[PDB]
Design a protein around this ligand. Sequence first.
Ligand SMILES: COCC(=O)Nc1ccc(Cl)c(N)c1
Length: 134
Amino acid sequence: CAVQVKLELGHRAQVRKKPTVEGFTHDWMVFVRGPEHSNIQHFVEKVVFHLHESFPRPKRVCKDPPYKVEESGYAGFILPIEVYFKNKEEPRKVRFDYDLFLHLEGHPPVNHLRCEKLTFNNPTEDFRRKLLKA
Ligand SMILES: COCC(=O)Nc1ccc(Cl)c(N)c1
């Protein structure tokens, strides 16, 4: 008995009124969430955000919602996002590569949304019940 769930991936990016001491020009926030009124905490063990190596401690872990990272920077990069599941079966996790892009000054702030579908063809009964609670 197969079950399908959706994950929304996205980010906001805004030019700062004043750069940081480091010269960071943008504030940004990247997130993973379920579609509105769905709680993916039922089946999500954790979300791991792999920032660019220039950031201190680039492996940002969110064990609880909201699964998000608020940061400042000066450039965009590829941000691998691992979503770990509350199970002990294949798959234990899924990985996406998120394009964390920033817009130049004068353009409206970035408000970007992606949707990814997760198909689980034969999950265990406990995992299926978690997926169906979201
Ligand atoms: C210290 O972090 C601030 C920052 O934005 N670092 C950063 C981000 C993306 C790229 Cl591609 C590079 N080279 C550096």
